[PDB]
Design a protein around this nucleic acid. Structure first.
Ligand SMILES: Nc1ccn([C@H]2C[C@H](O)[C@@H](COP(=O)(O)OP(=O)(O)OP(=O)(O)O)O2)c(=O)n1
Ligand SMILES: [Ca+2]
Ligand SMILES: [Ca+2]
Ligand SMILES: [Ca+2]
Length: 438
DNA sequence: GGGGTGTGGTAG
DNA sequence: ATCGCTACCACACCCC
């Protein structure tokens, strides 16, 4: 299905695991809001809480293995390096098992890159996606978590991951013996309920330490590390980009500024708050500083104190940066129209209008090959964005699609140089019962 | 003090 | 072959 075919968006989203991830996450958040419309559902100043951060180990790889076709009968999850991917070369490894990771393979690597990490005779097993079973195993996960009746708040993070909060009465002497019991119950009940998937669990009294504890626990384990338990041994165990919020760009800046720390212990012994803030910015610097103390920042805590506002959707968009090869502006405009139709179907499902929209595009870099290394990839591009305030909030196709096509024209991208498009509704407006307006 | 725009970055 | 999405904080830099 080419990008000028009316079925392209349907086919692309059907095959895109990144689309599936975002849609699943959005749907879990909507369900949380719907199930909690009447309930208080939030941590109070008065609560002392424990965080149980629970997450499937190598989720797609595990499920796709447990569900593999007869052709993969013989595959051994504990001995073979297994990846889930569409392709054979410049195709993303969506998930890899811990055997593969023992050779240095990582989620997001191209199969082409991963294969070079393997010694002679060691063969990469590549399993197809099983999207519907990913969903079904997630359902079993979330159902088990609720049925245990041990959590005061269950927060969806993604298809395979939840932050679960237990409030501890001041009446009650929490102990790690009780926490280990709960961890082991959760792991067993989910292993049973999912027919063979494993989860790991990080357990702490901050979100950030629960996240690091989760990392330490993997694969197929649990780790309890409270602030009281912090030690050089703990911090020495983590790379810099194990901290939530530290990706590759922030890592690069930390390594430049602090002489290539090789563990969170190195960073914590070397940094100063002000140098940190200079390196990575004021809020991120404060976040990292607080994290290196085992403590959450104000922004991260909002999910505990006001989950309904955190989880409420504030924008709606689609992004298509793969398979984009148009010959003329007629075809670009029709695709923009198809994208607007899709977005408006979603906007109407949530009973909202929009007052502000954006078109963003990827354009081939002047010196970048027409056909990039990744088949149908966007390749190396320059990004361009323009937004427009609509005035009266609307859900009218005619208004929105017209302004989107106009936004496209102002960015000046020749159709044959286009490599990607995003269509965004940046501001959403409730629809109430009263619609009488002059 | 309040508003605005486009862009960087991260996560899963 | 191959399916490189998408929500949202923070930021720089503009206005008054
Ligand atoms: N670069 C990525 C990262 C994740 N995912 C999908 C596949 C993962 O199975 C799943 C969940 O993401 P996680 O980051 O939780 O990773 P895994 O569950 O695969 O491994 P881990 O045991 O490290 O949590 O999301 C993907 O397609 N591409
Ligand atoms: Ca996981
Ligand atoms: Ca996860
Ligand atoms: Ca990180």
């Amino acid at each position: 299905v080419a990008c000028d075919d009316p079925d392209f968006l349907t086919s692309y989203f059907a095959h895109s695991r990144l689309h599936h991830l975002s849609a699943w996450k959005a749907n879990l958040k909507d369900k949380f809001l719907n199930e909690n419309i009447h309930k208080y559902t939030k941590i109070t100043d008065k609560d002392t809480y424990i965080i149980f951060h629970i997450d499937f180990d190598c989720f797609f790889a595990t499920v796709a293995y447990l569900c593999r076709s007869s052709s993969f009968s013989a595959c051994d999850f504990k001995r073979d390096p297994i990846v889930v991917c569409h392709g054979t070369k410049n195709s993303d490894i969506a998930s890899c098992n811990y055997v593969a990771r023992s050779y240095g393979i990582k989620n997001g690597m191209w199969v082409s890159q991963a294969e070079k990490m393997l010694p002679n005779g060691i063969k990469l097993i590549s399993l197809p996606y099983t999207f519907e079973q990913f969903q079904l195993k997630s359902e079993a996960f979330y159902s088990t978590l609720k049925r245990l009746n041990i959590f005061n708040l269950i927060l969806p993070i993604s298809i395979d991951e939840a932050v679960c909060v237990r409030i501890i009465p001041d009446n009650i002497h929490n102990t790690n013996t009780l926490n280990a019991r709960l961890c082991e119950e959760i792991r067993q009940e989910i292993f049973q309920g999912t027919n063979g998937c494993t989860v790991s669990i990080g357990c702490s009294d901050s979100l950030v330490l629960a996240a690091l504890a989760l990392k330490m626990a993997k694969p197929n384990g649990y780790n309890i590390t409270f602030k009281s338990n912090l030690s050089e041994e703990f911090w020495s165990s983590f790379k810099l980009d194990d901290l939530p919020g530290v990706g590759h760009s922030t890592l690069s800046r930390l390594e430049s500024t602090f002489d290539s720390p090789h563990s969170l212990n190195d960073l914590r012994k070397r940094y100063t708050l002000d140098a940190l803030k200079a390196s990575v910015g004021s809020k991120l610097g404060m976040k990292i500083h607080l994290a290196l103390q085992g403590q959450d920042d104000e922004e991260s805590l909002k999910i505990l104190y006001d989950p309904k506002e955190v989880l409420q959707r504030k924008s709606l968009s689609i992004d298509i940066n793969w398979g984009i090869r148009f010959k003329n502006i007629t075809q670009v405009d029709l695709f923009i129209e198809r994208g607007c139709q899709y977005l408006l179907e979603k906007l109407n499902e949530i009973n909202k209008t929009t007052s502000q929209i954006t078109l963003k595009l990827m354009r081939r870099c002047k010196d970048a090959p027409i056909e990039p290394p990744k088949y149908m990839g966007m390749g190396r591009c320059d990004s361009f964005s323009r937004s427009s305030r609509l005035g009266i909030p609307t859900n009218e196709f005619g208004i929105i699609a017209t302004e989107m096509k106009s936004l496209y024209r102002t960015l000046g991208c020749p159709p044959m140089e286009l490599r990607g498009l995003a269509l965004q509704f940046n501001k959403l407006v409730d629809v109430g019962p009263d619609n009488n307006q002059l």
